[PDB]
Amino acid sequence: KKIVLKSSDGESFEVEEAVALESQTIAHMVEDDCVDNGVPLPNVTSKILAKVIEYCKRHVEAAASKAESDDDLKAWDADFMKIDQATLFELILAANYLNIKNLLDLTCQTVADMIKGKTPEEIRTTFNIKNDFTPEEEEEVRRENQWAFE
Amino acid sequence: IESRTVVPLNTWVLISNFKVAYNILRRPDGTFNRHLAEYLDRKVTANANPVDGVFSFDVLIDRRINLLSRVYRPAYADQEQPPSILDLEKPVDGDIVPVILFFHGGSFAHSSANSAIYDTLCRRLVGLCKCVVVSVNYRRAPENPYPCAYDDGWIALNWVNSRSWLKSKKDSKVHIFLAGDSSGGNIAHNVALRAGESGIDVLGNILLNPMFGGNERTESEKSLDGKYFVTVRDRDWYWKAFLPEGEDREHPACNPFSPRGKSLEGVSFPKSLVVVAGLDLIRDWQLAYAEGLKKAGQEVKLMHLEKATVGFYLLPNNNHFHNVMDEISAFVNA
């Protein structure tokens, strides 16, 4: 079976039914019907939906073949994480809005890995964020964590 | 079955129990079970009161690295009462008094200076050789690898040489002999090498079943593997847990006669007594070590015991014990 997904912009993507059932939310809406006419998405960009669909596609295909391998999968995942910052951000929001656990773990692991071995003056530089602590609060939190600075 | 025919029953049971204990304390990853080892270990305490002509006491020679030294000496003839704390370090009486600085065995991993198996050996050494004996408690890999043992030996040697109550009438100098067994043989050899080009003069060395090795499997490892309470798996684990990660057995601390090691010819080295048990797994290396000395131009008397194994100097119920003791007594009191 083929499912038509409609992005917010208006691009249409043809997907394998199986691939669609990888999303438990889409599967749940499909059992509840009212989805045979089309499954629209309110907040989802066509480019990010396309990237997630390629990910689920490849994964599903690999899984089916094996049932009928892990190194190739790992290589593909490492090759699909060669993007910048803001694209990973749009991908995490999309993964949350659609609930695809495996992609969420991969993206959270990549963000965790980049912020590995970083200090308070480094993470701030990477994300350009505002430290909003008062001097007293900052010294108190630093003192609570002083064991980590040795 | 073969092991029950070459040694008595008590030595067999002792060595077998040690072998089992250190089997169950080994770990493939490389870590060592320290707490259970210290539990299963049997230690003793110093006793200032004379016991068959031998008292003893602990000396905290170094405090930064908890380097302790247990000193033994003969009981005092002119003192009927037990020596007091003040009298413990009184200068010795006699023209020449030897001082044996002893290092115990245990493949840099087992036992300690206050262990009973070595306390008894030091007491017997004092009794038969009639001289002072200082037992050094060096640090033990794998928690503290190379080169902390040679440093501890060197510091203890400096402390022994720097004393005043341990001296000689004829030359106002200390007559120091370095001795060791198993791993202590290697430590004694390295500290003697260091002293050779430092100023301290050493009289001699007493290497007992020294622990040397290399990469190329000799011809006594294959056949003897797992026959006399000694295997090769352990021979690799102990060398791996001692040398620095990312190093082979051709390191100089493992094989002095290596292409990277400095030649012994042209440098000062003292006389030495190499005792080699024929039935030990490491019989081709110890003998090779003696030959390296022989071609290096240094004096060495080889004592090949054709029917001895490891641990032949822990119980007095054999014939090799008396022999070795007599040779050391004639080599120290010469």
Partner: protein, 109 residues
């Protein structure tokens, strides 16, 4: 412009020392850092074959103080020499004994 839930999802998979360092970057991250689930997971990382429930133990530890004070008071110095070492049952017994004794020390009559 990150939210709260996603910060927790990201930080679920970070190591102890890095999470402690990250606790001092900003307010939202500081607030996310004390959620006892993260420290519970970091403390029960190597606890194989404990012998009691993970809920009962959780109740007791929350009664006595928490997990941030159990891994940054006794577990840390005890693991300072050898980092790569799994914590058995003895580590749990010792650390909880010290934590309960400290709670008694701070207790008021």
């Amino acid at each position: 412009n990150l939210d709260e839930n996603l910060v927790y999802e990201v930080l679920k998979h970070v190591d102890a020392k890095t999470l402690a360092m990250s606790s001092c970057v900003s307010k939202i991250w500081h607030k996310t850092a004390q959620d006892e689930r993260l420290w519970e997971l970091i403390c029960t990382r190597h606890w194989t074959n404990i012998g009691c429930g993970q809920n009962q133990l959780r109740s007791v530890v929350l009664a006595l103080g928490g997990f941030r004070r159990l891994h940054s008071l006794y577990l840390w110095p005890l693991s300072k020499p050898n980092p790569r070492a799994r914590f058995g049952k003895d580590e749990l017994k010792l650390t909880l004994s010290l934590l309960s004794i400290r709670y008694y020390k701070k207790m008021s009559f």
